[PDB]
Structure formats: C-alpha cells, structure tokens
Structure 1
Amino acid sequence: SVDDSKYQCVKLNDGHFMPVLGFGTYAPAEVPKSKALEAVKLAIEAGFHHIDSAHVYNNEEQVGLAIRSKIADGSVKREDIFYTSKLWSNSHRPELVRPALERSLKNLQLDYVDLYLIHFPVSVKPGEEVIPKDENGKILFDTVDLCATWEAMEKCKDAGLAKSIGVSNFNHRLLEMILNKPGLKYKPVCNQVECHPYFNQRKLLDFCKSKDIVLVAYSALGSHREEPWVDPNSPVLLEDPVLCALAKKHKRTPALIALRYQLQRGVVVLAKSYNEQRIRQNVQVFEFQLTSEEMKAIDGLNRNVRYLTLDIFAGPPNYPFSDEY
C-alpha cells in the first residue's frame, strides 16, 4: 500500500467527512453472524473506512467487535472508521430514540456512531416485536410525527452519541417536511436510498444536491435478492449487457462499473460482500475512471426497477415509494 493513511471522503453539511465507499453488512437470515465479524475485518483490511449497519440487521455485536478488534491490533484508528447505525421503526416515538441509540452503542461497545439514520419513515408500534401484528396478521402501524423523531435525533447529536444524523428511504415530500421543520437545528446529512443503474434516482438525487444532502446508495449492486423482500424475477443488475461490455473494455467487473458510476455522479456508494475476493475487488473502484460517453450509456439503463419496495409498509401516508420521487 503506497499511502493508506489517506482515502476519498466527502464533506457533509455539518462539517464531518464521509468516506465515499461504504461496506454493507446486511446478510440474509440463513447466514450465521460469525460471518459478519470476519467480513468486517476483511473490509477494514482491504481499505474500507465506512461501515453501514442497523439495529434491525441483528449484527451490531459482531460488527462492533470487528471494528474494535481492528483498532486494538493497530490496523486502524477510531477516527478513521465511519460507522453508521439506524433507528428501527418501533422506536420513532421521540421518547424511544435515544434509548434505541444507547442500545446499539451497548451492543457495539462503542461510545458513538458516526452516523445515525431514521431507517424507514413508516412507524410501527413500540415493543419487542420489530414488526408488530394484530390478531388478523395486520401490521400495527403507529401515528408518529417524524419532526418529533428528528428532534430527538438532534439531541443525540448534541449529546455526542451520533456525530452526524440523517435519514433513509425518504422521498421528496418527507425530506421537505424535515427541512421546513420549526426550530430545525441540523439538516440531515444524507438520504440513504436504493440506487443503481436500473433505478438511478436522478430526480431525488438532484433534489438532495440542491440542499447539500448526500445521497447514499444501497443495493448499488442489485441487492441481496432475498425473498420475500425482493422478487426473484426482477432483472439481475449485474448481468446487464452494457455493464458487462464496459467491464470487459476496462478489464474490470460489472460490479465495479456500477460502483464507479455512483462515485462519478456525486453519490456515496455502499457495497455488501462477505467474500474475501469481492471485498477486495470492490475497493478497485478508485483505480479507474469512466468517460462521459460511458456515464451517458449507464444513465440510459434507467428502467424503474425498484428491488426493495418494502410494501409490507404501504398504506400510511409516510410510505415513501408511491410518490413519483
């Protein structure tokens, strides 16, 4: 490694710096958790400085241990790790936001997260069930004002427990509601949403840019494809023939093309892998560049394919994916 003390970062609207390539940690239920531990250690070792998890992924104990293990063995300093967690929808009530963050931190054994996000804007009833249901099997939705959720998030930042705060799965209207909030103290630094060449989010992205909100792309390689979350007949992004042709031309891979596309359009990009080789491969995103004509060809792949509809949460007004953007 010629110089691993530096790496590519973007300045967020609160003055903190976010590494532009993030390691995704979600794995399907059939995968055991010891795997998350090793994969995060490998990611750190490969040069990932941004690590994305969430309370609901049920891996934070493992992800935390991997981070502390790599600090303790001298590979990395805490300040050169950007760690994201997320507030699950059964803790949107403002009184529960801080306890949920403290709980993440306790599982992690870290003093702070770098970023805390409202994970999804549809609230469900508080309690131990992450998806609470009634006698008829219907989800018990909760009526919570997310402005009040945001205010509690602001207090977490002021207490130092989250260096930065942001949102996920917010649409144009929901972001406006937060930006116009009475007494707003901190804008969200980011909106983490699904983004890839079949769903390139240009309209939402331009809106985010106009407000200096960074868009953070998940499922940027086409998603984990885990049923029932993702339909098995959705097209497989990484078999796209334009992506494959650019990959061959560049002597890279479809995945790397998909990742590089996001970097060049100003998006911070996540990439999940629990495989040694693919983990290292994904860091190659910084070793080549796409021309304007290649970026235009990738822009032309847009085709309204949303892998993660999360339509179990459809119905309430805060369900984000029924508006155009």
Structure 2
Amino acid sequence: SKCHCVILNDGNFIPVLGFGTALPLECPKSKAKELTKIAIDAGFHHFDSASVYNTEDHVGEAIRSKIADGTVRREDIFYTSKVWCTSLHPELVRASLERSLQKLQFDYVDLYLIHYPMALKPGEENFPVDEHGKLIFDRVDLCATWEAMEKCKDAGLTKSIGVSNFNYRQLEMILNKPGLKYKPVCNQVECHPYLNQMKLLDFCKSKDIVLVAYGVLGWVDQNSPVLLDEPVLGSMAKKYNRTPALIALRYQLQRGIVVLNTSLKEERIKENMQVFEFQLSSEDMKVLDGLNRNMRYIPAAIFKGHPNWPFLDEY
C-alpha cells in the first residue's frame, strides 16, 4: 500500500499514476504480459484493463509472476477492469466481472467501471453489427447496472466501483438515484492539454468524484501536427529538460487528476516515474490551461448514433 496516492470517496486509495493495458491492434495480446512485467519493474502499482481489451489473462499472468517471485504482493497492486457495452443488463454485470476474475486468476479487482454509458446487443461478440456494419444498440436502465455494480462491491468482487465516459448529466442520473448506496469513485475519460476537461473536472470534484485521465499524450491526418509536437509542451520540456510527454503528465497530476499512460517501449515506461521528480510553476500551469481546444481524439465514432452517446453535451 505504498503509493503516490489519492483517496476515493469509499475510503480506498488509488495510485495517481497507472499503466493502461489496451494494445495496438497489430500486437499479439501476449505483449501485455511483457509490458506489465516491465511496468512492474519500473515501480508502477496501478494497472488499467477492461474485459474488452482481451488482455486480462496476460496482465494477470504478468502480475502473478511478479508476486510469485516476490517483487510485489497482491495488495500492492491496484487492478482495474470494466464491464463492456454488451454486459450492462443488470444480470450480465457480475457474470462478466466473475469471468474477468477467472481470466486473471484473481479473487478481486480493486476497481470496476462501466466502460461506456451505452448498451449493445448481448453477448459474445464485442461489436454486434448488422448487414451494413452498424452496431446493434441495446436499451438498459443505467441506474440498474449501477445497482448491479453496487452488489459486486458488497460481494467483495471489486473493492471500488466507478464509471467511464459519462457526461455530467449521466453522472447526475447516478448520483440522484433513489436509494443510491455507493457513488462512483471516479469518471475515467479522455483528458489532455488540448481537452483539459475543466468543467467535468470541476463537477466531479464538487461531487467527491475523482477524474481519471486516458489519451493523456493525445496519412495526412496521421502526419499532421500531433499533440506532443505542441510548441508550448516542446519549450516547457526544454525549459525543464524533461520530455513533452512528461510535461503533459505532470500538468494532470498538479490538477489532482489520476493519470493512466502506456507505451510499447521500456525506456518510455520507465520515464513515467520522472513525473514525481519535478514540478510545473503556477504560471506554466496557467499557460498549459491555455492550450484547451476541445480536441477529442477518442470520440468512439461508431457509437455516435447511440442515444446515450456521451460526447454531444458540452461536458
């Protein structure tokens, strides 16, 4: 339990820097094993996975390996999973979490999220499509998923519950539910200097909810200027002799935001702990606040026509 940590509203602690375990589609899923071992040797305790990545076997094998040989204990690991759009029906939530625990060979996850606020046809295929390649959308009472999330916590299957990719109104719906037992501890969303999420952040904090960031570092499209090509991150990196990456990471930390980051490169994975080594100044923080340009690199476009698509409201 030794940590660079913030407390969540149910009294559990999460490491403020975590390792994402979704892979490039061109990687063998086994790559998440190797990367997890590397991230563990680098000093990472927080691992972020979901049913849908198809990486949870490999990550658990990585972690169990490093428990066996005594690098870490289970209690030193903060592990996150998420229920996928296809299992949001209340009966389907715990069944999917129990499956995940089978794949990991765990007793529990530390955190369990609703991945999106959008249901798809059950069950086995993660992207159920019809004749013309369009997702088959489903209906569910999210308040009922939540109740089901809530029972998973009571059963000891997960230590905390939260959500991901909710807008503030979808968050509201949960918080105003009659008979609510547990608030989401977090809302995990895309967050970076180009999409700094200040209004959602401000709303979460007002409701005792932690913001957890991903997409933290952001042919014509592919090769046009990128988030880390950003001139101000470039100069602040040199001004600090850190990387542009490490500026954007530290930006988030000084804002009380939990950061997830990933990389295929070990040297890259190790550099993340540098985020603990320096500090940005009040003025650099305010300059960095000025980069916000409503740039959403991860809009989930195939879901765009779903009634519950989170990315329409302002925040």
Identify the range of structure 1 (192-201 vs 26-35) with the bigger mean alpha-carbon deviation. Answer: 26-35
**Aligned partner of 2:287: which letter?**
A
Instruction: Work out whether residues 234 and 305 of structure 1, in 8 Å CA contact, stay in contact via their aligned partners in 2.
Output: no
What is the match of residue 105 of structure 1? 101
Identify the range of structure 1 (136-145 vs 157-166) with the bigger mean alpha-carbon deviation. Answer: 136-145
C-alpha distance in 2, partners of 1:69/1:198? Answer: 38
Q: Equivalent residues in 2 for 1:73-152 (5 A)? A: 73-152=69-148
Corresponding residue pairs, total: 314
2:171 aligns with one of 152, 156, 175: 175
C-alpha distance in 2, partners of 1:300/1:169? Answer: 23
CA 1:322–1:235: 2 relative to 1, 3 Å: farther
SS at match of 2:119: coil
C-alpha distance in 2, partners of 1:233/1:280? Answer: 26
SS at match of 1:232: helix
What is the match of residue 40 of structure 1? 36
C-alpha distance in 2, partners of 1:101/1:234? Answer: 40
C-alpha distance in 1, partners of 2:225/2:89? Answer: 37
Deviation (angstroms), 1:317: 2.7
C-alpha distance in 2, partners of 1:52/1:20? Answer: 12
What is the match of residue 188 of structure 1? 184
**Aligned partner of 1:125: which letter?**
K
What is the match of residue 303 of structure 2? 313
Deviation (angstroms), 1:136: 3.2
Instruction: Work out whether residues 154 and 186 of structure 1, in 8 Å CA contact, stay in contact via their aligned partners in 2.
Output: yes
**Aligned partner of 1:116: which letter?**
Y
Alignment RMSD (CA, Å): 1.3
2:231 aligns with one of 218, 241, 246: 241
CA 1:140–1:10: 2 relative to 1, 3 Å: same
Instruction: Work out whether residues 192 and 248 of structure 2, in 8 Å CA contact, stay in contact via their aligned partners in 1.
Output: yes
Instruction: Work out whether residues 134 and 302 of structure 2, in 8 Å CA contact, stay in contact via their aligned partners in 1.
Output: no
SS at match of 2:11: coil
2:150 aligns with one of 151, 154, 177: 154
Deviation (angstroms), 1:13: 0.2
SS at match of 2:160: strand
**TM-score after normalising by structure 2:** 0.97
**Aligned partner of 1:272: which letter?**
T
C-alpha distance in 1, partners of 2:268/2:49? Answer: 19
Deviation (angstroms), 1:71: 0.8
After superposition, the C-alpha distances for 1:19-60 in whole angstroms (9 at most, x for unaligned) are 000001111110112211011111111111110011111110
1:12 aligns with one of 8, 12, 31: 8
**2:284 paired with 1:294:** yes
C-alpha distance in 1, partners of 2:84/2:222? Answer: 26
C-alpha distance in 1, partners of 2:245/2:313? Answer: 29
C-alpha distance in 2, partners of 1:7/1:135? Answer: 49
CA 1:295–1:53: 2 relative to 1, 3 Å: same
C-alpha distance in 1, partners of 2:278/2:78? Answer: 24
Unaligned runs of 5+ in 2: none
2:269 aligns with one of 276, 279, 293: 279
After superposition, the C-alpha distances for 1:127-151 in whole angstroms (9 at most, x for unaligned) are 2111111223321100101000001
**2:293 paired with 1:303:** yes
Instruction: Work out whether residues 36 and 274 of structure 1, in 8 Å CA contact, stay in contact via their aligned partners in 2.
Output: no
What is the match of residue 262 of structure 1? 252
SS at match of 1:164: strand
C-alpha distance in 1, partners of 2:153/2:12? Answer: 12
What is the match of residue 65 of structure 1? 61
**2:199 paired with 1:197:** no
**TM-score after normalising by structure 1:** 0.94
**2:14 paired with 1:24:** no
After superposition, the C-alpha distances for 1:261-302 in whole angstroms (9 at most, x for unaligned) are 000001000001121100000111000000001101111111
C-alpha distance in 2, partners of 1:55/1:204? Answer: 26
After superposition, the C-alpha distances for 1:78-110 in whole angstroms (9 at most, x for unaligned) are 111100001000000001000000011100001
**Aligned partner of 2:205: which letter?**
K
